[PDB]
Design an enzyme around this catalytic site. Structure first.
Site, short mmCIF file in Angstrom:
data_model
loop_
_atom_site.label_atom_id
_atom_site.label_comp_id
_atom_site.label_asym_id
_atom_site.label_seq_id
_atom_site.Cartn_x
_atom_site.Cartn_y
_atom_site.Cartn_z
N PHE A 126 60.66 80.11 50.27
CA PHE A 126 61.18 78.51 49.72
C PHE A 126 60.08 78.56 48.81
O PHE A 126 58.47 78.50 49.60
CB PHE A 126 60.81 78.25 51.19
CG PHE A 126 61.52 76.87 51.01
CD1 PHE A 126 62.76 75.79 50.70
CD2 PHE A 126 60.32 75.47 51.46
CE1 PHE A 126 62.69 74.74 51.21
CE2 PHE A 126 60.23 74.24 51.08
CZ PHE A 126 61.35 73.44 51.32
N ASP A 211 52.17 81.99 45.84
CA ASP A 211 53.23 80.91 46.85
C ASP A 211 52.39 81.44 48.36
O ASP A 211 52.80 81.58 48.76
CB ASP A 211 54.30 80.78 47.31
CG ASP A 211 54.11 78.94 47.27
OD1 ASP A 211 53.79 78.69 49.14
OD2 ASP A 211 55.98 78.90 47.39
N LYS A 240 49.38 72.03 52.74
CA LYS A 240 49.08 72.35 53.95
C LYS A 240 48.62 72.16 54.41
O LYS A 240 47.28 71.73 54.84
CB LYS A 240 50.65 73.70 54.40
CG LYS A 240 51.77 73.41 54.26
CD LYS A 240 52.84 74.57 55.64
CE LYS A 240 53.89 74.67 54.89
NZ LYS A 240 54.38 73.54 55.76
C1 LIG Z 1 55.98 78.74 50.85
C2 LIG Z 1 56.20 77.62 50.39
N1 LIG Z 1 55.85 76.59 49.42
C3 LIG Z 1 55.91 75.29 49.19
C4 LIG Z 1 56.48 74.68 50.45
C5 LIG Z 1 56.53 73.18 50.57
O1 LIG Z 1 55.83 72.66 50.96
P1 LIG Z 1 55.28 70.64 50.31
O2 LIG Z 1 56.39 70.08 51.65
O3 LIG Z 1 53.93 69.79 50.75
O4 LIG Z 1 56.11 70.58 49.29
C6 LIG Z 1 56.73 75.17 51.91
C7 LIG Z 1 56.56 74.30 52.93
O5 LIG Z 1 57.28 74.90 53.87
C8 LIG Z 1 55.82 76.19 52.17
O6 LIG Z 1 56.58 77.17 53.51
#
Ligand SMILES: Cc1ncc(COP(=O)(O)O)c(C=O)c1O
Ligand SMILES: Cc1ncc(COP(=O)(O)O)c(C=O)c1O
Ligand code: NA
Ligand code: NA
Ligand code: NA
Ligand code: NA
Lengths: 385, 385
Positions: A126, A211, A240
């Site tokens: 994700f 990520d 986050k």
């Molecule tokens: C690993 C990862 N990357 C990206 C995101 C998305 O972050 P955002 O909601 O601030 O766009 C998430 C959200 O859960 C995530 O867990």
């Protein structure tokens, strides 16, 4: 009645928070083990973060990237110094940070060949909801209504060295990986898999992108998960927890991946002084002497109790995680959604995830007594589930 | 030395702002006619916005979309009531808002046919830097290093009814338009063109999407530009000024376009209480009795002076705009970048744009005397350019 129906919510309206607790309009206290989905690293209304926000708000909150501002410069220096020492780009969210990473990878690839634009990511990964990040996100269900998406992406099985190997080619410009998958149900990568990813990217001249939007900013017991694993990426994305609640995202690149030039990418709000001020406060707290050591100890304590629960409760099929990022999987006849709902009814907030799991994502400032309360509440729910 | 080199900046570090003025570390005052690129609608450190931010910061800044929060609900109601009355989705930036719009359009199209996924946008338009929005952005130079982008997009000439008509087909799910193009150099659409777009979308069953990220939130003298034109879109995107400096974005849809369902789209930070609190404050100020009327009067005053300048100065080729969104184009032998730099050296901040133009984007709270200072400074620069 004026919001689009895009979310599955717990029936509660929160108006105040302090530490690990959040309260509704009537003052009912909920033990927040969601951290706003791994965002509130320092808990709610942390004195230092609140003071930094209030101080900056009366000075300057937005000037645009036409100029320089001090918090932005200070945060960039802190992020570089506390990682593998590279350059920084400030975005506003996790998906924006990953979009920047995708663009960095694409430009890097075209330095060598016009055909080098393929990007590999893991099944069930994700990375975000905007179209670039959504294509990186290895989950068809979230993509189908919006196709066609970005061309050039292919997926491999997480932790499967053989599968990643067979999909590598000279036309690959990057490999995206969450050191610990989150939305899929907290699945840590094996050190061996990450090491192979690093080797394959060097072999095929591709950028290794980690990520750490969910597993980063101290949650694993180190500032970033890659530091626990000992595998260094070319690109690192974070969001986050970076702002402890204030929207902010960032991408860090080494010299090899530092290919963006003036005009290649940008953002209106990215790098604003208010968000960067928050980030500076968060990093200074996380790097304070002994802080991350306490996180590791609390993580070990919580994990110990949940692993005991796994042996003791037949409805608990598995417990996975690192630091304070832990997932609890239930047997198929038990609904993770029902468990989360019952926890909510008993004043414990948890986050549902894939693979029939619920996530324990307490603030890094969580107390041992609060860890005890959370575990006790979950056990009572399971004793009647 | 730790920031990626993605921006072309003016050599100044700002640390404090008040009203239409921003100051560097030594206290030098600059008349800010950039508004942080149309973001600081109420100017810097507006008492009400600062107080709202400080108050909310000590209460709750982020709880996630797992729950409800009051500022989010209040802002959604205000946005619906002050527009064409629809449903709202909160994003964090302009590009994220447009990505949501693209996804809404894509899902709408698939309600009728799997081939109905084409999206039309204008040449020289600007909708964002994330991959979906970047494909919508009709500017090859910003896309080339990152291709391949999202399939299904085609461009038409802005204000060219015939060109838009010839590119319409039953397979089009949406037509994207900035009522007034910004990055391209402030180019207002003609009412006739917008009316034809509305008719064509009805004829081919496509969604008309208005990107008011730059021209929205009171800058034209009305809350939104579409209200000045009298043409109502199916979807409306907003950001920049919506939060008066605090990152926030939003998408508003009518019933026809309200097709998103639980899980289709989402964002971690979107709709957080701190940003929505800022938005509520901004909207309440903009809708205060007589506020927008003053904006229109100030806009007329500024435009009058700039139009006189156009006749008087041979180096000024054209002046375009609406309300407090005005672009000044110079003859080709004169560099818009040089003019902006000289303005900066004389303590006036302006924003360069395409078509060899500079943009006057003062806060909506700008004083008449400040408008006089800005015009005087520009004239002096041109008298020696
Ligand atoms: C690993 C990862 N990357 C990206 C995101 C998305 O972050 P955002 O909601 O601030 O766009 C998430 C959200 O859960 C995530 O867990
Ligand atoms: C019309 C329009 N849409 C979208 C954007 C991008 O907004 P953001 O930078 O917050 O992603 C801009 C920025 O200039 C814009 O002018
Ligand atoms: Na068990
Ligand atoms: Na068992
Ligand atoms: Na002239
Ligand atoms: Na002339």
């Amino acid at each position: 009645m004026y919001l689009m129906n895009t979310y599955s919510r717990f029936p509660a309206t929160f108006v105040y928070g302090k530490g690990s607790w959040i309260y509704d309009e009537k003052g009912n206290a909920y033990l927040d083990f969601t951290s706003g989905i791994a965002v509130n690293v320092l808990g709610h209304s942390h004195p230092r973060l609140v003071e930094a926000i209030k101080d900056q708000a009366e000075k300057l909150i937005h000037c645009s990237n036409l100029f320089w501002n001090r918090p932005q410069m200070e945060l960039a220096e802190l992020l570089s110094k506390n990682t593998f020492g590279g350059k920084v780009f400030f975005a506003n969210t996790g998906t924006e940070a990953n979009e920047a990473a995708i663009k960095i990878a694409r430009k890097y690839g075209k330095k060598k060949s016009e055909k080098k634009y393929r990007i590999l990511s893991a099944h069930n990964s994700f990375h975000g909801r905007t179209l670039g990040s959504l294509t990186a996100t290895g989950q068809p269900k979230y993509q189908k209504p919006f196709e066609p998406l970005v061309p050039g992406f292919e997926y491999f099985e997480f932790n499967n060295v053989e599968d990643l190997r067979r999909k590598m080619s000279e036309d690959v410009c990057a490999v995206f990986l969450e050191p610990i998958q989150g939305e899929s149900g907290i699945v840590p990568a094996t050190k061996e898999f990450l090491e192979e990813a690093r080797k394959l990217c060097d072999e095929y001249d591709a950028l290794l992108v980690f990520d750490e939007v969910q597993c980063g900013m101290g949650r694993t017991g180190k500032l970033f998960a890659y530091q626990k694993y000992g595998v260094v990426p070319d690109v690192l994305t974070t969001a986050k927890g970076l702002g402890g609640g204030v929207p902010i995202g960032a991408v860090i690149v080494n010299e090899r991946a530092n290919v963006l030039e003036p005009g290649d990418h940008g953002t209106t709000f990215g790098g604003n002084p208010l968000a960067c001020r928050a980030g500076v406060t968060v990093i200074k707290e996380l790097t304070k002497e002994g802080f991350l050591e306490e996180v590791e100890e609390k993580g070990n304590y919580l994990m110990k109790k949940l692993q005991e629960m796994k042996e003791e409760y037949d409805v608990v099929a598995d417990v996975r995680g690192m630091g304070l990022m832990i997932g609890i999987q239930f047997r198929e006849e038990v609904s993770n959604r029902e468990v989360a709902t019952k926890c909510f009814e008993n004043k414990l907030l948890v986050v549902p995830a894939g693979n029939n799991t619920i996530r324990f994502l307490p603030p890094l400032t969580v107390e041992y007594g609060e860890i005890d309360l959370a575990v006790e509440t979950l056990k009572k729910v399971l004793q009647g589930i």
